[PDB]
Amino acid sequence: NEDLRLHLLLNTSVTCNDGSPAGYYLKESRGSRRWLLFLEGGWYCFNRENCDSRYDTMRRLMSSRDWPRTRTGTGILSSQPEENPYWWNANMVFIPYCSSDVWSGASSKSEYAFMGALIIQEVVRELLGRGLSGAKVLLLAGSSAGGTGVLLNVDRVAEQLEKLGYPAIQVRGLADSGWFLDNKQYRHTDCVDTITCAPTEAIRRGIRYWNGVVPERCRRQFQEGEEWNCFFGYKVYPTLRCPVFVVQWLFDEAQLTVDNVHLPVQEGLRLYIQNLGRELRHTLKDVPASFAPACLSHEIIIRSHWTDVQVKGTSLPRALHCWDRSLCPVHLVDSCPWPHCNPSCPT
Amino acid sequence: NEDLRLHLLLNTSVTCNDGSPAGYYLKESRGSRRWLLFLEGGWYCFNRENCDSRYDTMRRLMSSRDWPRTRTGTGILSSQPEENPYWWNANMVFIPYCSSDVWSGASSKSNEYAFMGALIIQEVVRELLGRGLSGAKVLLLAGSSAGGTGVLLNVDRVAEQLEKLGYPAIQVRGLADSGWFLDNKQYRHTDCVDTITCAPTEAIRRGIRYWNGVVPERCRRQFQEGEEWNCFFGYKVYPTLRCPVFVVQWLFDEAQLTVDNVHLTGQPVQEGLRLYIQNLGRELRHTLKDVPASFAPACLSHEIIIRSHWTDVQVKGTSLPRALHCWDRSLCPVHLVDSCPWPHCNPSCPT
Numbered sequence A: 001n002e003d004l005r006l007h008l009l010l011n012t013s014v015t016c017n018d019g020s021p022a023g024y025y026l027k028e029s030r031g032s033r034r035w036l037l038f039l040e041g042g043w044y045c046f047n048r049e050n051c052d053s054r055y056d057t058m059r060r061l062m063s064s065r066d067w068p069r070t071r072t073g074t075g076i077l078s079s080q081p082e083e084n085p086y087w088w089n090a091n092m093v094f095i096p097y098c099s100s101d102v103w104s105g106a107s108s109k110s111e112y113a114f115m116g117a118l119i120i121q122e123v124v125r126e127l128l129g130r131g132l133s134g135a136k137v138l139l140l141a142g143s144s145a146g147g148t149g150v151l152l153n154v155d156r157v158a159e160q161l162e163k164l165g166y167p168a169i170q171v172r173g174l175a176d177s178g179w180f181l182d183n184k185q186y187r188h189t190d191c192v193d194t195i196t197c198a199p200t201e202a203i204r205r206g207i208r209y210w211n212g213v214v215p216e217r218c219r220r221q222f223q224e225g226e227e228w229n230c231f232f233g234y235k236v237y238p239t240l241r242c243p244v245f246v247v248q249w250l251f252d253e254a255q256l257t258v259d260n261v262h263l264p265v266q267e268g269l270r271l272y273i274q275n276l277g278r279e280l281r282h283t284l285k286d287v288p289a290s291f292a293p294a295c296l297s298h299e300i301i302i303r304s305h306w307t308d309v310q311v312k313g314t315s316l317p318r319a320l321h322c323w324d325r326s327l328c329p330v331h332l333v334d335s336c337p338w339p340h341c342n343p344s345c346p347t
Numbered sequence B: 001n002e003d004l005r006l007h008l009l010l011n012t013s014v015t016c017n018d019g020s021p022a023g024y025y026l027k028e029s030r031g032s033r034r035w036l037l038f039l040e041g042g043w044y045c046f047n048r049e050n051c052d053s054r055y056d057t058m059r060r061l062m063s064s065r066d067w068p069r070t071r072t073g074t075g076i077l078s079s080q081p082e083e084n085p086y087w088w089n090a091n092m093v094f095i096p097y098c099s100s101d102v103w104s105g106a107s108s109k110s111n112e113y114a115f116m117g118a119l120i121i122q123e124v125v126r127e128l129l130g131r132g133l134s135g136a137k138v139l140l141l142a143g144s145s146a147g148g149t150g151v152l153l154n155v156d157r158v159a160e161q162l163e164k165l166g167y168p169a170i171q172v173r174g175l176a177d178s179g180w181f182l183d184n185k186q187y188r189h190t191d192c193v194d195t196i197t198c199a200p201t202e203a204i205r206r207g208i209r210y211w212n213g214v215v216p217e218r219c220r221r222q223f224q225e226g227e228e229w230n231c232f233f234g235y236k237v238y239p240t241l242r243c244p245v246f247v248v249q250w251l252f253d254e255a256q257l258t259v260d261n262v263h264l265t266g267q268p269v270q271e272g273l274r275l276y277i278q279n280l281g282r283e284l285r286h287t288l289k290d291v292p293a294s295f296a297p298a299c300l301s302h303e304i305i306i307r308s309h310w311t312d313v314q315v316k317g318t319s320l321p322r323a324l325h326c327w328d329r330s331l332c333p334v335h336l337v338d339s340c341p342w343p344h345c346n347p348s349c350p351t
């Protein structure tokens, strides 16, 4: 059977938001030495009222209470050769996002618990006893908040492994839709909701609220109290030790959301969406391992139709395989200034 | 905290519809000698076509693949004194419904769906024996909807299973909630296509054959071979039951009304309909006349015993928790049937 099976963490102090046990889903591939560890996304909450609102409407993302005992791997987590041509035979790990902290929270005592960073550490620990100790490659992957979770945790995982005495494991990151800009909103608004709040201000508040840690290498590049900078890809990325492949829609829906763009087209708005994509292209200029198509979308790597997207006649699975080889083209950014200008874009 | 923990059946050849392992949730109460085994409901499917659409639309009821590792006991399964004042401390078991066969499938053999409801119950009971059940005084087999009818189909089989296994000191009892149906004429006829609106006699006739379903022997020996469908209907199977069985049944069950093709959208209500609903209450009350242990409010609703608000409904000043406690004593009124046959004549009906 191909289903990933749920394991809830044995260590008791590491929990979801509501105190219920955190966990991970696993499908072993007992001949393979490739490990794919996926971090789920789905926003965050940065004060009590917002978190209480998320609890009433999106409880899945704050609790393990109703997690199914198995899960079907999809996209990059699929065991179907046709859905996942290069990596279908890998050991597959799915880590549910139940900490609402962009996987940054690192204090083990608690109201709502915020333990994103410790959940990862603890998943890694358990996996060692389940084959991870024999790995050639551990690819920490993630979508949206999980994608930003990758940039926040990839070096911490590399260093956890080497401190645990497994330095041969090669640790890499794949960040999908977690590469945002701390930019000016289109039309300004106050920080009320999760949805509307300015990228900068959301993280500023969040980090204080979660006791969030940022990677040590990025942290020391900024003054104490300015740790928020490290939640933004173009700032944390240059500091990274592990190789990280960046997948980002040039017009990410979540980027637009926090930028306050709601969707008839205003002419002032056309010039902003144009500019945003150009700035993103700019930030990705020196990012050798990247796949940035000019579409209006959000997330891709565990979507089934992740195979159908192409940039410069190359698919995403191919780009990733070229990247794995490099350690066929690898730097795939669209020079194409408008949404839907790629014919590959999802429907 | 007080959550029931999942155990999948060790014998993996006893399965849900799709081949996945069946199982049960358990909360151990080691100081208690009472056991409550709950059978979940949620319809059935009686041919390949609607079993396929049920698989597309309601996969949870044909598979164990999406079950959580733990479950909170509610109502009669709750460990909260206030939610469940007499039984909070019992040993608690929830048996999810993944067989779509009203718990009647006894056939291991079966590319087809597998129907193993009666075998699932059998396996749950035998596993439980090694987890404390062997030292029990009371095993109450409870169920809601299809699980309610499943209680009627299975309670004596469980009693026979335990005596044969050398545990005669376990008193087996039944609690059937919303599993007491009439094999009646529909209000407006439909062709038997959709599960939920296929006339009840016809649905069961097809089901039994499709599931290779079994009915209790004592009821079976009372009808012609091939007419075993009769034994899915409470008033027909109840008289030959050996085990004592408490019957909880809304006078106007939404599932009964649905298989009768009655739809209470609102607006005015026609005279033909009014007449039909009146007769339904009457026939239902009549079938309960010689059931000493019953609780039948005049409400339009579905299921109750694992609902959090199961403590609120009253019949003649008596609550369901109390009614059950009284029944426990008997083995303090126990025969509680509303006499006004209109939905909501009773003021304590659920909203």
Ligand SMILES: *[C@@H]1O[C@H](CO)[C@@H](O)[C@H](O)[C@H]1NC(C)=O
Residues within 6 Å of the ligand: B011, B013, B014, B108, B119, B123
């Ligand atoms: C399941 O396995 C047990 C022990 O191996 C056996 O005794 C039991 O009868 C089996 N049940 C069925 C229905 O095959």
Ligand SMILES: [Cl-]
Residues within 6 Å of the ligand: none
């Ligand atoms: Cl295991």
Ligand SMILES: [Cl-]
Residues within 6 Å of the ligand: A302, A303, A304, A305
């Ligand atoms: Cl999809």
Ligand SMILES: [Cl-]
Residues within 6 Å of the ligand: A328
């Ligand atoms: Cl190649």
Ligand SMILES: [Cl-]
Residues within 6 Å of the ligand: none
């Ligand atoms: Cl155990």
